[PDB]
Design a protein around this ligand. Structure first.
Ligand code: HEM
Length: 291
């Protein structure tokens, strides 16, 4: 498989900035979702899940083809709860019918990180909708009940190394686990719709206790009301992951820098960019625009 990025015909930076503006204006507006967490956290999770299906061995899956729109990928058990992020973006797609689905689902994640005070994420247009038979089979997305060795092996399929994996996992400072979606319950911290290095500080500073929850899954719980998935708790049981955790806990700007690079890499895996293609766009926030 080769997936060559093709620009939506006749569109430039200013068009994509209009789609970004519509998603961010709708984020401000619908602030009541999930006990006033807002749709920020569920939109960066949709962008990682349509990206996380990629397989470096045969160039299948990844963000290119927009195939989350098809029933098979939409109804995957590991995607439960993401129907909310899809529903949110749907009026935005009716307003800009020219943008491809892969470009929309992925720009949704970029807009959410930057509106939640996160780092600027460079983004590239050019994903193209592919047919229903290119939709990846279920089961390429990761389990939560596992250890640091599973996490290392998994992210190798997306050729993410240790630094990339630890930066990327910092996203779990956002939102929460929901019992009806995943069999896990609880937030990762206090500031869960502001993008910070909080996930790392919690993992180093809380007295975590292992307990079973109401779905009979184990998770790590702290006195403070926060939780950790076994796979996130893994990052302090592995000596290479633990030194990077410590680095991000002590330096939020190094976390922002590395998260920016790894998240763009994640959203562009599997896509060939012709060098006449536009350079990656940096979108302005609402605030920077006075909107
Ligand atoms: C081994 C890797 C990962 C596993 C096993 C995993 C698993 C999960 C699970 C079980 C949930 C809760 C789902 C729910 O009940 O609603 C969750 C939530 C979330 N995940 Fe991950 N995750 C992984 C990697 C990532 C990465 C790479 C990102 C983003 C860069 C990410 C971002 C999020 C966010 C923001 C949420 C919050 C969802 C919400 O608030 O609704 N995850 N993750």
């Amino acid at each position: 498989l080769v997936h060559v990025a093709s620009v939506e015909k006749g569109r430039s930076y200013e068009d994509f900035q209009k789609v970004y503006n519509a998603i961010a204006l709708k984020l401000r507006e619908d602030d009541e979702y999930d006990n006033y967490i807002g749709y920020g956290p569920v939109l960066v999770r949709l962008a990682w899940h349509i990206s996380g299906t990629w397989d470096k061995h045969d160039n299948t899956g990844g963000s290119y083809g927009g195939t989350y729109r098809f029933k098979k990928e939409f109804n995957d058990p590991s995607n439960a709860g993401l129907q909310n992020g899809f529903k949110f973006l749907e009026p935005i797609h009716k307003e800009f019918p020219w943008i491809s689905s892969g470009d929309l689902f992925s720009l949704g994640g970029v807009t959410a990180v930057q509106e939640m005070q996160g780092p600027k994420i460079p983004w590239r247009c050019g994903r193209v909708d592919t047919p229903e038979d290119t939709t990846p089979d279920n089961g390429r997305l990761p389990d939560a009940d596992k250890d640091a060795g599973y996490v290392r092996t998994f992210f190798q399929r997306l050729n993410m190394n240790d630094r990339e994996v630890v930066a990327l996992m910092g996203a779990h400072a956002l939102g929460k686990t929901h019992l009806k979606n995943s069999g896990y319950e609880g937030p990762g911290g206090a500031a869960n719709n502001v993008f910070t290095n909080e996930f790392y500080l919690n993992l180093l500073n809380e007295d975590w206790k292992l307990e079973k929850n109401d779905a009979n899954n184990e998770q790590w719980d702290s006195k403070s009301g926060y939780m950790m998935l076994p796979t996130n708790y893994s990052l302090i049981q592995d000596p290479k992951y633990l030194s990077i955790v410590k680095e991000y806990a002590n330096d939020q700007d190094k976390f922002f820098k590395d998260f920016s690079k790894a998240f763009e890499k994640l959203l562009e895996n599997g896509i060939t960019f012709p060098k006449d293609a536009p350079s990656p766009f940096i979108f302005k926030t609402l605030e920077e625009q006075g909107l």
